[PDB]
Amino acid sequence: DIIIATKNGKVRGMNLTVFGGTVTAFLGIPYAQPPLGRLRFKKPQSLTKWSDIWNATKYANSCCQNIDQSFPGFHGSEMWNPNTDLSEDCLYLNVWIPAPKPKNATVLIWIYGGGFQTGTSSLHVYDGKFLARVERVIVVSMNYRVGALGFLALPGNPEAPGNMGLFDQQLALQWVQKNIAAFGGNPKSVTLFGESAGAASVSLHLLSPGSHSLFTRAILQSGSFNAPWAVTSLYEARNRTLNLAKLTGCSRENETEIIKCLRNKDPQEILLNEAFVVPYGTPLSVNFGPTVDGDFLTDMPDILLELGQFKKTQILVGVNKDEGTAFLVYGAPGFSKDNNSIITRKEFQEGLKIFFPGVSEFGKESILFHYTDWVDDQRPENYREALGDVVGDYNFICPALEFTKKFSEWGNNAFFYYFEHRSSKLPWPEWMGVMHGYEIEFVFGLPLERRDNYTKAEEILSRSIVKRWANFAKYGNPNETQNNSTSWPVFKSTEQKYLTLNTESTRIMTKLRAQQCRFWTSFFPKV
Numbered sequence: 462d463i464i465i466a467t468k469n470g471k472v473r474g475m476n477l478t479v480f481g482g483t484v485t486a487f488l489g490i491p492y493a494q495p496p497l498g499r500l501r502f503k504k505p506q507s508l509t510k511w512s513d514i515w516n517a518t519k520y521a522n523s524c525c526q527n528i529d530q531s532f533p534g535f536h537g538s539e540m541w542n543p544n545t546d547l548s549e550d551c552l553y554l555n556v557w558i559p560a561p562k563p564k565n566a567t568v569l570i571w572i573y574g575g576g577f578q579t580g581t582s583s584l585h586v587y588d589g590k591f592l593a594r595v596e597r598v599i600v601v602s603m604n605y606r607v608g609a610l611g612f613l614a615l616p617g618n619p620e621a622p623g624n625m626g627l628f629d630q631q632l633a634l635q636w637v638q639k640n641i642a643a644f645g646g647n648p649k650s651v652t653l654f655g656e657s658a659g660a661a662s663v664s665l666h667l668l669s670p671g672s673h674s675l676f677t678r679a680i681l682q683s684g685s686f687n688a689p690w691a692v693t694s695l696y697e698a699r700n701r702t703l704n705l706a707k708l709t710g711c712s713r714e715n716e717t718e719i720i721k722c723l724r725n726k727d728p729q730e731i732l733l734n735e736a737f738v739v740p741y742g743t744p745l746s747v748n749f750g751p752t753v754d755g756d757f758l759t760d761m762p763d764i765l766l767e768l769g770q771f772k773k774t775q776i777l778v779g780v781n782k783d784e785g786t787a788f789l790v791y792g793a794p795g796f797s798k799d800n801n802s803i804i805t806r807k808e809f810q811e812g813l814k815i816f817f818p819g820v821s822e823f824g825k826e827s828i829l830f831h832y833t834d835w836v837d838d839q840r841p842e843n844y845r846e847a848l849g850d851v852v853g854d855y856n857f858i859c860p861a862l863e864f865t866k867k868f869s870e871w872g873n874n875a876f877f878y879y880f881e882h883r884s885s886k887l888p889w890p891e892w893m894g895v896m897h898g899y900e901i902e903f904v905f906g907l908p909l910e911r912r913d914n915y916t917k918a919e920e921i922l923s924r925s926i927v928k929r930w931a932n933f934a935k936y937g938n939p940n941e942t943q944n945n946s947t948s949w950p951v952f953k954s955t956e957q958k959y960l961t962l963n964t965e966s967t968r969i970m971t972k973l974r975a976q977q978c979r980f981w982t983s984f985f986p987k988v
């Protein structure tokens with residue numbers, strides 16, 4: 462038996478067998494008053510004590526959210542769908558502790574992605590038990606509100622001030638600060654790591670004064686706040702709050718009345734109209750996302766980055782080789798997970814109109830000009846590959862590199878990775894390559910299960926990544942020192958060295974996508 466006394470009450474965990482060892486799991490501890498009723502759309506409120514023993518022996522409810530039903534019964538999509546009951550009562554977190562109980566263990570706090578509209582901490586690929594057993598770190602992860610329930614913005618008005626889900630994350634970080642020592646954790650050695658919107662969230666915690674003292678270091682997997690999809694403008698946040706009001710018959714005068722009207726709509730009705738507040742959408746469409754609210758975010762984040770207004774600490778940042786491909790089968794004409802998706806020049810151009818909705822004719826022509834002058838003009842995959850390269854560079858690689866340049870220019874050590882291994886078990890077709898999201902299982906050490914049909918090379922890659930992430934969290938330096946590994950140099954603004962992650966050949970390279978990112982970060986934002 463294992464029972465820990467926390468500031469708000471006692472909680473009991475459960476023992477798990479992992480790799481001939483033991484991990485102690487506390488699944489579904491609450492960290493806020495459930496955001497129900499008059500608390501919907503507001504910032505999370507503190508938790509009042511409890512006298513009993515909270516039973517933290519199963520994952521809690523996922524937050525209300527729309528589900529991806531584009532491929533029913535397909536594991537490639539459905540492995541990301543919520544695996545616990547949806548509910549507005551979803552502000553819970555999980556804690557994996559090594560066994561026996563550590564003394565001063567470094568803490569890894571996971572923030573899931575999902576475009577700020579979906580996601581849950583209970584996904585199988587976020588299972589922290591492997592990291593706790595292998596590296597003896599504590600792993601925490603939390604559920605935070607998503608979609609309009611998490612990011613509906615009327616800027617200023619405290620009934621719907623925006624960024625509520627970010628404040629959910631922040632309140633969970635406070636909980637670790639006040640309670641993780643009871644579990645054998647070091648509140649002074651806390652590393653946040655996160656993928657996609659989770660990584661963007663981590664990047665925003667770096668910017669947010671209220672988060673400065675809640676963590677030590679930061680890891681950003683395939684995401685950062687300067688990604689095109691990551692921050693809703695206050696203009697469109699307003700148009701979107703108003704549009705959602707009209708679709709639900711909640712249009713009012715007194716802006717607060719709109720909120721009270723939405724506070725009596727059913728979660729499902731809010732959810733089903735969320736989709737329509739933008740004209741057309743893709744998973745890169747982030748209808749309700751982070752906003753400049755004057756509270757969590759005191760100014761436009763691009764300005765805070767430019768001017769060094771952020772927490773000074775080490776960062777680990779990276780991207781996958783084919784970030785873009787996954788999104789093409791959610792709208793790009795002529796793509797499918799079930800053919801090899803040879804598209805034509807005209808399908809390519811149609812694809813641009815979907816991924817760059819309000820961009821001028823000339824904007825789209827400059828994209829095609831830069832990406833469609835080939836070596837062999839006859840290679841049938843030309844346009845298929847270029848559209849994936851366009852989406853990934855624009856949405857992921859160039860923002861990640863831009864964030865890492867600007868962040869490192871203020872003196873801090875930064876390490877950049879380029880994840881190049883396609884999972885042997887990957888259920889999506891070969892043409893999508895090293896997909897967005899499919900480094901996560903290697904980070905969480907799933908391939909360390911020999912029982913699980915991962916190749917032996919994948920076990921080694923995971924073992925190394927896990928050691929580098931842990932050493933980064935413990936020591937600020939993502940090196941694997943024993944097994945004679947390539948040393949991971951710091952990313953500096955002149956040489957821009959980065960580390961490739963693969964089963965074959967761990968190489969040091971420089972100036973990832975130099976040509977393409979000059980297009981995207983220098984020229985394109987003017988159009």
Ligand SMILES: CCN(C)C(=O)Oc1ccc(O)c([C@@H](C)N(C)C)c1
Pocket residue numbers: 527528529530537538541575576578579743744745787788791898
């Ligand atoms: C908000 C509407 N819905 C349900 C949605 O956006 O679901 C997502 C979100 C992120 C995402 O990356 C993906 C695809 C490309 N991944 C392979 C999981 C689907």
Ligand SMILES: *[C@@H]1O[C@H](CO)[C@@H](O)[C@H](O)[C@H]1NC(C)=O
Pocket residue numbers: 513514516
């Ligand atoms: C917690 O779980 C144990 C199972 O051993 C049970 O005896 C106890 O009643 C549970 N407590 C609550 C509050 O459900």
Ligand SMILES: *[C@@H]1O[C@H](CO)[C@@H](O)[C@H](O)[C@H]1NC(C)=O
Pocket residue numbers: 564565647649
């Ligand atoms: C854990 O680390 C902190 C860092 O200063 C230190 O104060 C403390 O003594 C360490 N050990 C324990 C058991 O808290």
